[PDB]
Design a protein around this ligand. Sequence first.
Ligand SMILES: *C(=O)[C@H]([C@@H](C)O)[C@H]1CC(SCCNC=N)=C(C(=O)O)N1
Ligand SMILES: *C(=O)[C@H]([C@@H](C)O)[C@H]1CC(SCCNC=N)=C(C(=O)O)N1
Ligand SMILES: [Cl-]
Ligand SMILES: [Cl-]
Ligand SMILES: [Cl-]
Ligand SMILES: [Cl-]
Lengths: 242, 242
Amino acid sequence: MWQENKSWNAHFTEHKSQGVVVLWNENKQQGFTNNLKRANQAFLPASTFAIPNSLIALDLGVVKDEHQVFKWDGQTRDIATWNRDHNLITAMKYSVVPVYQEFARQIGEARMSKMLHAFDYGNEDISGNVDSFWLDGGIRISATEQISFLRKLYHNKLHVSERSQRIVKQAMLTEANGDYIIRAKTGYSTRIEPKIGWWVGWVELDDNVWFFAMNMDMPTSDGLGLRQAITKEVLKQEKIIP
Amino acid sequence: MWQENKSWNAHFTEHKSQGVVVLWNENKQQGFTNNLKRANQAFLPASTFAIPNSLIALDLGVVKDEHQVFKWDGQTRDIATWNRDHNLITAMKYSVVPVYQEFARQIGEARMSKMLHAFDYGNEDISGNVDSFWLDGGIRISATEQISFLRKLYHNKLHVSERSQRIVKQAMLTEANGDYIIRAKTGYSTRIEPKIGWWVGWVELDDNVWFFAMNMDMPTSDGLGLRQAITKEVLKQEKIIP
Ligand SMILES: *C(=O)[C@H]([C@@H](C)O)[C@H]1CC(SCCNC=N)=C(C(=O)O)N1
Ligand SMILES: *C(=O)[C@H]([C@@H](C)O)[C@H]1CC(SCCNC=N)=C(C(=O)O)N1
Ligand SMILES: [Cl-]
Ligand SMILES: [Cl-]
Ligand SMILES: [Cl-]
Ligand SMILES: [Cl-]
């Protein structure tokens, strides 16, 4: 099921990094990883929680559709792309935490807990503030657990409406060309050590789908680009992308 | 509120070509073109008919979803990408005419005629073979009529299910990056003169949608890349994409 290829460790050590890459081949039902222990270590999801958050908000009617405008509250925050109006698409593209905090408040602790357990999402513990539990609370998820959750979302197998899953997968669109399509979500956990960066999603090919989930130590914000770069080095090495 | 900007003709003249580019700014509700007369001139849709054809097939249940396999009939044809199995996604990516001909045969003349009237699609005339009318029959559509049809599709306003419109817009995915998303469909009309190439779709920005419809004379197949190249030249000039 899960095959450890320690050869991939060079992709982190060459960048003075520490992390895990997890790949799942949907057609052969095989998984690969550089580090089995870290692949099964759970971390704060950070902005990768935007995928289950958006799913629940859509299914419960908190969000009508991907065109609904969420107004900026006129308060300037550190990330410049946050200080403007957003919809479901740009909220995910720019990881607009205040938009998702409002989602969680409208969803409520009771319904958030039931959906996360139905999703089998991580440890299913929303301990902490309902608007911040994925940033400084008790919810934790591993790379392999991200893969399992994403595989259900791809097949529309999650216990929400098919429309909700289609819309969220549309918002996950990150990159597309004649060779591949990448639907993914970035993450950056900073409020509790260890500071890590996430990148989870999948690569759609013509005749296969390659799921991926990676996290890596992120002591400073200068290495955020390594999240996508290290993953693409593994995808290139594995003949998945040219 | 159309605006004719003959400056764009240089993008055609540089390649010793002739054609029309039509842009629609959805936010401002204003249009732009290099040739107003040709913008309203109707041609055979050719493979751009894959958009309404897939919509009808999905809504009628002829296609269950985007994963359903349409097996190759065994006949070797000129374009090698046609000689394999395809789903709704790869059929649109490779413009696999035999797949779409099979769609039209299962839809039938009566249901195809009424769907096109409901769509207000072009001259709504499906005269000819039920599996070739968009290639050598009587159906005609202009660039401005293509944009009219695409704007309804973008807002889920066509008189089919919202699900079928979402799936087709997923199949239209052509290119995406951090700057823009393009959902579009190419076309090459070769059976009846004049030989023309098509490119219709839209460019999704964070804050706006730019619908485009272009057609150009295509005497030989070696200029097909000019369909996207000239459109991007126009999009770059108007500061729509970097
Ligand atoms: C989610 O992981 C976070 C949020 C919890 O802070 C957001 C913030 C960022 S990048 C912030 C720094 N930008 C430039 N220096 C991301 C991200 O994934 O890029 N998500
Ligand atoms: C639709 O417009 C046609 C069909 C009617 O033949 C298909 C064929 C092509 S050409 C593919 C590349 N051939 C040589 N380079 C297209 C197209 O739009 O590219 N659609
Ligand atoms: Cl978030
Ligand atoms: Cl959608
Ligand atoms: Cl076709
Ligand atoms: Cl999409």
